[PDB]
Amino acid sequence: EQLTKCEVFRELKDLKGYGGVSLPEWVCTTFHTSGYDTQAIVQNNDSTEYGLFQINNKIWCKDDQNPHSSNICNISCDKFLDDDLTDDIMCVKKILDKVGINYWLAHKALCSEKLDQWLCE
Amino acid sequence: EQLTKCEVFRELKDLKGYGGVSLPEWVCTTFHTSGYDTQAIVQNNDSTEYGLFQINNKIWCKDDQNPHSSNICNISCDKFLDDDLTDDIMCVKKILDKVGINYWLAHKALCSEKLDQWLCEKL
Amino acid sequence: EQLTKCEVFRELKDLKGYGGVSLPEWVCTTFHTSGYDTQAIVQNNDSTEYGLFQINNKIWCKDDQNPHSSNICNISCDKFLDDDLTDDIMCVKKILDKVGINYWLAHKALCSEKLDQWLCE
Amino acid sequence: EQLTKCEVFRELKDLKGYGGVSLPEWVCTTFHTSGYDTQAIVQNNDSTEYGLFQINNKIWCKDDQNPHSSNICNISCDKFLDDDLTDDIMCVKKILDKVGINYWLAHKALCSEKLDQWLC
Amino acid sequence: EQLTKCEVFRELKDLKGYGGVSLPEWVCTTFHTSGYDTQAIVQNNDSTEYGLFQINNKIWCKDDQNPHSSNICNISCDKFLDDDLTDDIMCVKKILDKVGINYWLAHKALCSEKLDQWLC
Amino acid sequence: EQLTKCEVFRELKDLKGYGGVSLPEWVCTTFHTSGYDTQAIVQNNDSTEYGLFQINNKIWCKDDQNPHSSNICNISCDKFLDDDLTDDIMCVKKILDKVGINYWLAHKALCSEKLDQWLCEK
């Protein structure tokens, strides 16, 4: 499912304030990460990244590709491909606890200025 | 070279049933893999993926990046970027024989059901 | 920041002939590389690619992800996400000098021949 | 810092029985891992493995090489090169919890049976 | 097991002349690859190399670490840590077939001359 | 060639003080990286490391394995496998120039102090 900026904004309300990051920072980050596509999937030779936040199967979730993954989010990666972002949000909180919002390079690279444009009326 | 659901459907007829996988499954998988673009190419720091099936150059084919690739499909990777999908299919059959359809994670994740929407009637 | 074939053609003028490569080849390559988007950023498990030319943080530039980067172009990777392609071109000349145009597989695979459609007149 | 087959038994006591793995298995596994050298360090192009258990800087601990490591064990990797194996063991227990003893391929491979030679 | 140069020269007799490479070249190559240790194993974040020839689990054999390995040699990697080098040899031929002796960089760099010192 | 501490100490004189690192530090680091084996070669899936200093074919030199290496030292990797440490040092200087001594993780943790055992009163 390809969401609209305002839709992402709404759906991510649960992440508001987590780790102190605001929604415009989240909307901007996910835009540069998956272009707002909940079904985004990229398979490389060693790993595959899943969904809206492009979570990878080497550390966060379990795959057919990496069954020996640390699976920090204790979930099967494909659960990140459907339309209910509940699972994504749960795992993302785990990532923020372990590495921080800057785990995503796009946050600092493209989301530290002109933040008002990522806002929703 | 961008294709549509039914052109992919028509051109992958030879994979139909091969190894026990159905056509809608393939149409679905290639969609989530390359969005039906025969010239899709993704270069990473140490591996690059080619064509409609995004075949990588570490194992299946050879290119200047990984000259020591196992090159199981015995072909130069750029043959996967033309519009003739014959070379591609030969290789895919080799991948299926060795690893199976779920070698493509998108298949297991998004193309193992509800395939009805990947259908093209009259073939 | 999505350019058009001809804007790219215009902006990369300083690369013309460099390393013996013609502009139509440059236009073709960046099209297959970033789709002409000066802000393309692809983050993988341990490397991230930046901008029009998708320059990576393991060798050419400095990231928060790879601080021990050889950083051949002596620059922080995010300078490749702005609209000013000056940084990018300076770095691309470096890459050309060190490895060559075929460092980009898209060039060899698709942009060394049948260049007519990449012409901009 | 080189331990002998017997010191290892002593030092890894806290691991005994944890995750179902016995000491002789650990003695065997760590032998194939680091030769009982607690300062063992293998640096590759992208990853680096530290200490007796050869814990990597990509997932388990934080490095200068990999500052964005998920750092699951919440610790700086060089604390695995000291002679206090307390922090090592604590991290190993997390790996066991999250992945299991077979995360170490040498275990399943060479330290599954004939565990007699690994006694002290 | 830790073979000697002579023990290796004997057990790799089957590779004699395959793909055109001589026994000394093979002895030299394995020397620089594993020091003749048939139980040599090196696990990294993404792959693991096994045995005398340090065969990796991403392409040649089936692992717990890499179950989607193309498994070209249709064999589980642990079989490369046995003292019986028959499997190792079967797989090495496949590698010579798909890639060539120079798949091992040590061969081209160190085992292409001054070979008489690898004779037995 | 398997050298002794002092043979290595001797051969790396040009590196004395380069980038601020003393010989005792180098003699310690190279022992931890290659065991003083000038012919050490470690081949992995994606890269290989060569010689005394274990320089890789991903960034510093050119290989048949990685022909598209950035090849910063502008040298073919196997030149790092012989007895003459001259190219090795030339390249180590470039690495020190680009990334620094702590490019070698063993240095920081094991070869920064308590170096009595690594001196040579030659």
Q: Give the per-residue SS3 of chain A.
A: CECCHHHHHHHCHHHCCHHHCCHHHHHHHHHHHHCCECCCEEECCCCEEECCCCEECCCCCECCCCCCCCCCCCCEHHHHCCCCCHHHHHHHHHHHHHCCHHHCHHHHHHCCCCHHHHCCC
Q: Dihedral angle at the C-alpha atoms of C14, C15, C16, C19, nearest 10 degrees?
A: 140
Whether A58 contacts chain D with CB within 8 A: yes
Query: Residues 6 or more apart from F108 whose CB is under 8 A from it?
Result: D64, D78, F102
Contact F49 D48 (CB under 8 A): no
- CB C98 within 8 Å of CB C17: no
Question: Whole-angstrom Cα distance, residue D64 to residue C27?
Answer: 38
E31: part of which helix (H) or strand (E)? helix E23-34
End-to-end CA distance of chain B: 21
Residue E54 per-residue DSSP state? T
Query: Residues 6 or more apart from F58 whose CB is under 8 A from it?
Result: C58, C59, D45, F46, F47, F66, F69, F70
Q: What are phi and psi of E33, to 5 degrees?
A: -90, -45
Residue C79 per-residue DSSP state? G
Whether D65 contacts chain E with CB within 8 A: no
Question: Whole-angstrom Cα distance, residue C64 to residue C57?
Answer: 9
Instruction: For residue B48, give the 3-state DSSP assignment.
Output: strand
Measured at the alpha carbon of residue F114, what is the angle toward residues F111 and F117, in degrees to the nearest 5?
Answer: 85
Question: Whole-angstrom Cα distance, residue D27 to residue E34?
Answer: 22
Structure-token pair, residue B52: 């409609």
Question: Whole-angstrom Cα distance, residue C119 to residue C27?
Answer: 8
Cα atoms in the Cβ-side hemisphere of radius 13 Å centred on C100: 10
Instruction: Give the closest residue to B16 by CA, choosing from B27, B5, B4.
Output: B27
Count Cβ neighbours within 10 Å for each residue of A83-98 and write b for 16 or more, e otherwise: eebebbbebbebbbeb
> Which residues of chain F neighbour C71 with C-beta distances below 8 Å?
98-99
Q: Quick one: closest CA in B to C32, which residue?
A: B41
Instruction: For residue E61, give the 3-state DSSP assignment.
Output: coil
Give strand pairing partners of C48: C43
Instruction: For residue C47, give the 3-state DSSP assignment.
Output: coil
- CB F30 within 8 Å of CB F4: no
Amino acid, res. E22: S
Distances from the Cα of F52 to the Cα of C19, D106, F8, F28, angstroms: 35, 28, 10, 12
Instruction: Give the closest residue to E23 by CA, choosing from E1, E46, E7.
Output: E7
Question: Whole-angstrom Cα distance, residue C28 to residue C12?
Answer: 12
Instruction: Give the closest residue to B31 by CA, choosing from B121, B109, B90, B122.
Output: B109
Question: Whole-angstrom Cα distance, residue D52 to residue D1?
Answer: 9
Question: Whole-angstrom Cα distance, residue F104 to residue F81?
Answer: 19
Whether B108 contacts chain E with CB within 8 A: no
Instruction: Give the closest residue to D68 by CA, choosing from C67, A69, A103, C42.
Output: A103
Query: Residues 6 or more apart from F15 whose CB is under 8 A from it?
Result: F21, F23, F26, F89, F92, F93
Amino acid, res. B30: T
Amino acid, res. D30: T
Which chains share 3+ C-beta pairs under 8 angstroms with B?
A: A, C, E, F
Whether A106 contacts chain D with CB within 8 A: no
Structure-token pair, residue C45: 């498990």
The region, left, alpha or beta by phi > 0 then psi within -120 to 50, assigned to residue A25 is alpha
Amino acid, res. A11: E
Experimental technique behind these coordinates: X-ray
Question: Whole-angstrom Cα distance, residue C74 to residue C62?
Answer: 7
E73: part of which helix (H) or strand (E)? none
Edge-to-edge, what's the strand order for the sheet holding A55-56?
A41-43, A48-50, A55-56
Q: What are phi and psi of E25, to 5 degrees?
A: -55, -45
Question: Whole-angstrom Cα distance, residue E49 to residue E57?
Answer: 7
Sequence ranges of the binding site of A = 79, 82, 84, 87-88
- CB B27 within 8 Å of CB B8: yes
Structure-token pair, residue F11: 């051969």
Question: Whole-angstrom Cα distance, residue B35 to residue B27?
Answer: 10
Q: Which domains does chain D have, with CATH numbers?
A: 1-120 (1.10.530.10)
Structure-token pair, residue C80: 């490749």
Question: Whole-angstrom Cα distance, residue A78 to residue A63?
Answer: 8
Q: What are phi and psi of A41, to 5 degrees?
A: -145, 130
- CB E72 within 8 Å of CB E57: no
Structure-token pair, residue C31: 């099209």
Instruction: For residue F75, give the 3-state DSSP assignment.
Output: coil
**Least Cα separation, residue A80 to chain E (angstroms):** 21
**Maximum CA pair distance of chain C?**
44
Name the residue facing F41 among E49, E102, E105 (closest C-beta): E105
Residue count (chain A): 121
Edge-to-edge, what's the strand order for the sheet holding F41-43?
F41-43, F48-50, F55-56
End-to-end CA distance of chain D: 19
Question: Whole-angstrom Cα distance, residue C5 to residue C3?
Answer: 7
Question: Whole-angstrom Cα distance, residue C23 to residue C35?
Answer: 16
Contact A105 C45 (CB under 8 A): no
Contact A110 C39 (CB under 8 A): yes
**Least Cα separation, residue C2 to chain D (angstroms):** 30
Structure-token pair, residue F69: 């290496």
Find the radius of gyration of the CA atoms of chain B: 14
Q: Quick one: closest CA in F to C99, which residue?
A: F70
CA quadruple B57, B63, B69, B75: dihedral sign: positive
- CB D48 within 8 Å of CB D42: yes
Question: Whole-angstrom Cα distance, residue D48 to residue D31?
Answer: 18
